[PDB]
Each structure stands twice: as C-alpha cells, then as structure tokens.
Design a protein around this nucleic acid. Sequence first.
DNA 1: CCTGGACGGAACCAGAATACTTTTGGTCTCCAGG
Length: 786
Amino acid sequence: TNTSGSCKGRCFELQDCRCDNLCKSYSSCCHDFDELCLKTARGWECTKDRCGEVRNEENACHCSEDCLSRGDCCTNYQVVCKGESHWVDDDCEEIRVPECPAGFVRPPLIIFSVDGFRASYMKKGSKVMPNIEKLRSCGTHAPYMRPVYPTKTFPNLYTLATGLYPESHGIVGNSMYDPVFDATFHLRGREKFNHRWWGGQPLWITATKQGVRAGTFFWSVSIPHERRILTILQWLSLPDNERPSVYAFYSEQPDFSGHKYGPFGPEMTNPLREIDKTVGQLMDGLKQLKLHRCVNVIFVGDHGMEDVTCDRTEFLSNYLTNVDDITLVPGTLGRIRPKIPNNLKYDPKAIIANLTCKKPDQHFKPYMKQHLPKRLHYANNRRIEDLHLLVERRWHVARKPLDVYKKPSGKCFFQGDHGFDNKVNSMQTVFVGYGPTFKYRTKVPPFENIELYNVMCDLLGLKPAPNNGTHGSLNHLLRTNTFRPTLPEEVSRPNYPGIMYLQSDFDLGCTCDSTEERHLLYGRPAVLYRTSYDILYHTDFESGYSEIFLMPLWTSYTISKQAEVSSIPEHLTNCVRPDVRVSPGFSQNCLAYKNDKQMSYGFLFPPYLSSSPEAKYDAFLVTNMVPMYPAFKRVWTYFQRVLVKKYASERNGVNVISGPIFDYNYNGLRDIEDEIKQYVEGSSIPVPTHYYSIITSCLDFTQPADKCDGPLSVSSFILPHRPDNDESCNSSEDESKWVEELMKMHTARVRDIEHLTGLDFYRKTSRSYSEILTLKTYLHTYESEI
DNA sequence: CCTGGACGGAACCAGAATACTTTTGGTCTCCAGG
Ligand SMILES: *[C@@H]1O[C@H](CO)[C@@H](O[C@@H]2O[C@H](CO)[C@@H](O[C@@H]3O[C@H](CO[C@H]4O[C@H](CO)[C@@H](O)[C@H](O[C@H]5O[C@H](CO)[C@@H](O)[C@H](O)[C@@H]5O[C@H]5O[C@H](CO)[C@@H](O)[C@H](O)[C@@H]5O)[C@@H]4O)[C@@H](O)[C@H](O[C@H]4O[C@H](CO)[C@@H](O)[C@H](O)[C@@H]4O)[C@@H]3O)[C@H](O)[C@H]2NC(C)=O)[C@H](O)[C@H]1NC(C)=O
Ligand SMILES: *[C@@H]1O[C@H](CO)[C@@H](O[C@@H]2O[C@H](CO)[C@@H](O[C@@H]3O[C@H](CO)[C@@H](O)[C@H](O[C@H]4O[C@H](CO)[C@@H](O)[C@H](O)[C@@H]4O)[C@@H]3O)[C@H](O)[C@H]2NC(C)=O)[C@H](O)[C@H]1NC(C)=O
Ligand SMILES: [Ca+2]
Ligand SMILES: [Ca+2]
Ligand SMILES: [Cl-]
Ligand SMILES: [K+]
Ligand code: NA
Ligand SMILES: [Zn+2]
Ligand SMILES: [Zn+2]
C-alpha cells in the first residue's frame, strides 16, 4: 500500500491508499487521514459566539452561514443559531407517509445498535434517556427482543445482519477454532478479517445486489461517536446518484460499564445519558436535513447483562484431574476440546461423567452438543465443540485457580457479564422502530432477533436471502410494505383406509386379553414432502400414519376441562392390538421390542385419557405405538397422565398434537435418505431422537378450546429421547420433582417442530395468516414478566 | 504527599512474547515502607 497519497477531497469516500472508515483497522490510510478526516478542533457543538463565524477548515464541524448548503454543520447549528427546537422538545406527530426531499427514491434506514443494552434499562425512562424514550413511545416497540445463543456480541450482531442462527452464519462465538482451516478466530488479531469465516448474505450485500446503496456497517474503534454521526449525516447530503439508502451506527456502550458496575449499579445512569445524547445528535441532525419524517430508525441491542461476580465461579479442576490436557472457552458458557487438535487420547465420555451431577448445587450442566435444547439451534457447525457447558445465570466457569493455596482477598474488578441461555430474562435486549414505515405509538409482543433481517429487507424493498426468520411473522410492526405470505404447498395427500384385513392375517407376536370435528381443530397438518401415509380416525383421537416409518407422523386429540383421567386395567398393561385398516407389512411388531433389551414402547394418544372403557382399546392399537426407552417413558407417562389434564383444567381444554422427530445429524431439519442411524433390534422400525407436542387453546380462556372464536394460545416442546435421565440430577426421585422442570428447558416454537418434521400446522383457522405465523414463532419461556 | 506490590485467571483492556494468538498485569484499594 502506497500511503504517500492524500485523503484530500476523499474523506470517508464510499468507493493506492484508503480513506474509508476501516482503513485504520487494516493500516491502509493515507498519511494525512488523521489530519484531514478526523478533525476535532472546537468540539462538536455550535455556541452562540460561533454563529455566523467565518468558516475555518480546522474545525470538527461548522457554524458558518454556508454550512447548511455544504452539509457540514454541527448537529445543533439550527437550534443555537436559527431559533429551532431540539427534536426531543417537539410533539410526537404521526408520520402517515414518508416526507422526503425530491430525489429520495425510498425512505433511508438507519440502524442504531447498542452493545449490552438490557431490556429492563428502558424502565429508567425520559428522566435518563429522553431522546430514546420518545423514539420508544412514539414509534413501535417490543417489551424486549430475544437474542441468539450464545448471548455474546459477534454472534448476535452478525445474526442481526443475516437473519441466520450462528450455526448457519458461522460466527458461533467471539473466539473459535476451525479444525478444517486449522486456524483460530479472535477479536485480537487479523484472522477475523478473512472472509472465509463469515457466511450467509448480510444486509449490505443483499442491498447492493438489488440496487440499494449501503454505507459502512463497521466503525473503526478510534473514530469518535460524534464523528460517526456526522459522517452519516454528510453521506445523506450526497447527490441522488451517490447517496446510500441504508446506514449503521454502532456503540460499544453500555456494555463496558455493565461489566464494571453491574446492571443495577447507580453508575449505569451516566453511560445511558451519553448514548441518549448521541441519539439526540442524530435526530437533531436529521431534522436539520429535513429528513426526520423520512428516515426509518431502528434502535436495537445485541444482548443484555447479568449480575456476575468473583464469588460465583466454578473451577473444572474440582471435577477433572487433568485440566491441562484440555482447552476451555470459559465464563458464562463452556466449550471444551483437547489441547492438541484431533488428539486421539481425548475421551469426552470420561470427562462428561466427571462433570455430571457431582456437587449438590452444581452451577453448570454438561452436554454433548447434539443434546442441547433444540431451541438454541447450536450444534450444526464444525466450529462448535462437541462438549458444551450450559452455565447457570449469575455464575462463571473457569479452568483452574492459579494458586489453589492462596488466601481470600475479596478483590473483584467486575460485576456484570452476559453469554447465558437466551431465554434468561437478564439476557433480553431492546427493539424500537421509528419512522414512516413503522406503526405509530404501538407496542408489539417480544420477538427473536433472527426475524429482523426480513423486516429490514421489507423496509428497503429487498427480497431477503434464505434465512431463519419466518417472513410475515412481524407484519404487525409495519404500517405498509408488508410481505404477503402464502401457505406452503402440500406435496402428499392422505389415504383414508377402511377395514381391509382379518385379525388372522397378523403375525406380529402381539397379545391382548365427529372425530375430525372434535380432535383435529385447525385442519390436518400438511405433509410437505412425497410419502405414503394413512389418516386413521378413532373416538378419542386422529392420526396420520406413515408407511415408511411404521408409526404416526402426528396424532391429534382434544381434552376438555372436565375430562377424566383413568387407570390402565392390570389385565391390559401389555395389550397391543393389530389395526385391521393397515397391512401387516406396514405394522410394527411386538417380537422386535422383546428382543431389543434397551427399547420399550409407548403410545402417542394416552390410554389414561380414553373417554370410556370400550374406547380405551383403541389406544392399544399397534398404529398408536412408538419406540421409547424406559427412562424416557418416565417423562412421557408423567406428561400424559398428569400434565395434559392439568393444562386442560388451567386453559379450559387443550388440543394436543404429538409425534416423533428424527434428527440424527442435528441440523434441525427432518432427516432424509438414510440419515436415520438407529432401529429397534432386528427390525426396520426407526428410533426417534426427540418427541414433540404442540398444546393449543383459546387466548380467551373463558371459551373452551374446541369452541374458540378469536386468537389462539400455544405452548410446545421438543423432548430429547434419551436412554437415561442423566440430564436431571434428581431423577431418582418421584417425577413430581423433576419432569416438569425438564420439559420447560426443552420448550420450543411450533416453527422449530415444522423444520424437524416437514409438517405445516394451523392450515384451517379463522385468523389472518400473518397472525398464525406470529403464533408459530412464539416461544413459551416460563420466565416472569420483565 | 511519594514508590512498590498484590489483586487473579473468571470481566475488559492493552502491553509484551509465546509472536497477530496467547498470555499477563492492571483495574481499586489496601498494605508495606520512606
Ligand atoms: C436456517 O437458514 C439457513 C439458510 O436457508 C438454512 O441453511 C441452509 O440449509 C440448506 C439445506 O441443508 C443448505 O443447502 C445445501 O446447500 C449446499 C451448498 O452449500 C453452499 O452454498 C450455499 C448457497 O450459496 C451456501 O450458503 C453454503 O454456505 C455454507 O458453507 C460456507 C462455506 O463452507 C460457510 O461459510 C457457511 O457458514 C455455510 O455453512 C453452513 O451451512 C452448511 C450446509 O451447507 C453447514 O454444513 C455449516 O456447518 C453451516 O451450517 C455453502 O457454501 C448444497 O450442496 C446442498 O445440496 C444438497 O441438497 C440438494 C437438494 O437441495 C441435493 O440434491 C444434493 O445432492 C445435496 O445433498 C443443499 O442445497 C444451505 O447451504 C444452508 N445455508 C446456509 C447459509 O447455512 C438452515 O437449514 C436453517 N436452519 C433451520 C433449522 O431451519
Ligand atoms: C474423575 O474423578 C475421579 C474421582 O475424583 C478421578 O479419580 C481420582 O484421581 C486422583 C488423581 O489421579 C487420584 O489420586 C489421589 O492422589 C494421591 C497421591 O498423589 C493418592 O495417594 C491418593 O490416594 C488417597 O485418596 C484419599 C483421598 O483423600 C487420600 O486422603 C488417602 O490418603 C489416599 O492415600 C489419591 O489417590 C484418586 O485416587 C482418584 N480417585 C478414584 C476414586 O479413582 C479421575 O481421575 C477423574 N477423571 C478425569 C478424567 O478427570
Ligand atoms: Ca436432520
Ligand atoms: Ca498474574
Ligand atoms: Cl465465545
Ligand atoms: K424391550
Ligand atoms: Na438423573
Ligand atoms: Zn455485545
Ligand atoms: Zn460484554
């Protein structure tokens, strides 16, 4: 690079040495970049004595009479010198259409992202943050926005830009080892600048591909905030054929002060006031350009902040005798791998056993990554280590003390940290959208940050790249430019078999001593791939029975608020009955379950909830049976016998849809073409990796689930089908003490279940479709309200 | 008031050497001295 050139007339140019706002991070600036592009003289504010000054090229910004036409006024110039008001002192006025100067072809978007802005900081209100609080109350806001896991900065910022889970965009932590590159990504170092780390298609690329020009989305750490704002405002003054339409501002605060003082320290007020001042400089500057009723502004955080101190550290050396032979990414999560990459003597089975339920109130839990809760979507990337530690909120994990023998000093230089499970309340962050395209004075329910990329594409007129948002689920944020979603097309249609076989046709080794109106409430699920399946009706339930898997894809039934739970008679404990509607060759068989000494079986519709002794015999049909480990039947039985009825009594009836999931390669997608790796011994009955249930009722619970007029209410889960209950440290006790807690950990979205099964639910309701897409992205988190 | 040392491996930051990732001292406050 020839740094002998000059940045004269090129400062922060958007197209030899460089003068853009990343040259410093690459060490490519022309020698006079600092002198010409980072002026600082006289600060960032006009004063009464500067009004009408003779222009002086040394000043950071100008208060001369010409600064308006040259677009380089201080952001407060009009207020101090021409009698105008600060944007924050003006009334809220609805913006029904964009009010943009001639030559603007579309409303610009400015993304204002803050680091470590916990959702509950908004409770400080206008006394601390008057500009932000006016954006929030005049625009559209969520009470919180859910980040992705791990709740660290780089995974979340790049999720914001791409709409992808970290396992898909590839930035799975702030530091990473990639065994194929054999290289390490680190915030310190040049390797992170290599494009091979960064997957997906971020918004600035989507924009350029479709004719929408982008400003920078990265800012060099040494460029002060006021200068970033003034640069964006100067870009917005460029001619129509050079001006960008999408911009990004980033602040590292208030993350650093949160680390030092903690989220509840009175010291948090000052960094929040400082951010608010920068927001006020932007809004005043836009008002000075006559763009304050033309630009869409998004104020968004990457994650929250939790109380974490030195008194709450677990050390792996208290569990493992050789912590020198492993590498640990520590803190609010744990990722473990061998010190020597691909070391053949690395034994994660011995490691995980020593880390499982070893101390009474142990403040982390180990997982092989395929056993993490599916809602984290944190497994399908070679940069994610197989061995993972989920750390309890407010705690850290560390590798080992330096000197195990030294005394208690009581010195701690930090009080906050982030990185925990993304459903923890302290990790939630902020979302505000203000402008012509967002709604006016509107509160919307919490939503996940993977959904934002689609919205930003809608605000710019862009077709999104394939991503993990559900396009249309945030239409209720927008006054216009909504996306019109359409139902996925159904690929397979069901057969409806009648009675076709005799009992005597079956040699399964088994022994035994208004259906749609009632049990399928929202239409049958569509099967979105080619397959042969049967729909089977019974008094108490309906099912879609797969000929390939030899079991239901789904089973649907409605349990009313007054339903009765009954016992299985002792003479029917082991009853299994051939189904005369379904061929012997497309049935499971009981011999395979006897021969398999690890596998038992359960039922998708529970016999416990049968409507009469006669109807109960339907529950023992071989077409209702599914393979289950004995340890898992403890969970599933408690769900069926205890929890379904409880939910029915609390929600005024429930509709339940349950079924198997196969995801042996842990990519979150229904698996296909020989990816299933386990079968019941000697048979072609595949073994599920998970079981799901979707539990729906009326949002207005004064109406019974089967007679619901308005919006629906849903909760769901994806339970891992494990041969032991090692995940639950007190599973040796009665199920009342651990099963429900386990289920809450594995809560899921209906959407997560659609990916994993290839089914599409809620196809026949009386609701608009965009409302159903919102319902399908809902996650019941079991957390108190923020 | 001044200097040095410890803090403790967990947070962030910004100096080095281990050499652009990895590792360490500092942070604030107290202790020891002059
Ligand atoms: C969340 O949303 C994302 C985006 O839609 C979904 O991920 C997509 O999933 C599909 C289905 O598996 C993948 O399709 C397959 O694509 C490959 C070609 O892949 C290359 O080209 C695409 C298109 O440009 C790139 O996006 C891919 O990028 C991956 O690799 C680069 C370089 O290695 C890396 O930097 C990226 O981060 C990214 O890695 C991630 O994806 C891969 C899987 O591709 C995964 O292994 C990794 O760990 C990360 O997760 C890539 O450069 C194509 O060969 C395949 O063909 C197969 O299917 C066809 C039928 O379609 C068969 O006929 C054929 O014989 C093959 O068997 C697939 O089409 C797609 O790559 C992937 N996209 C991304 C960006 O990840 C997720 O599934 C969604 N998650 C959930 C839970 O819904
Ligand atoms: C998983 O955890 C197990 C159990 O902690 C662990 O096995 C233990 O490893 C240590 C280290 O090898 C063993 O060694 C100890 O070290 C001394 C000498 O240096 C031995 O004399 C000790 O025997 C004493 O044991 C008593 C314990 O207090 C002493 O008080 C007594 O005086 C004995 O002399 C002791 O052996 C330790 O023995 C094992 N324990 C068992 C049950 O094996 C294992 O290494 C861990 N695995 C992994 C992968 O980390
Ligand atoms: Ca799969
Ligand atoms: Ca040290
Ligand atoms: Cl990380
Ligand atoms: K068995
Ligand atoms: Na257990
Ligand atoms: Zn962050
Ligand atoms: Zn942080």
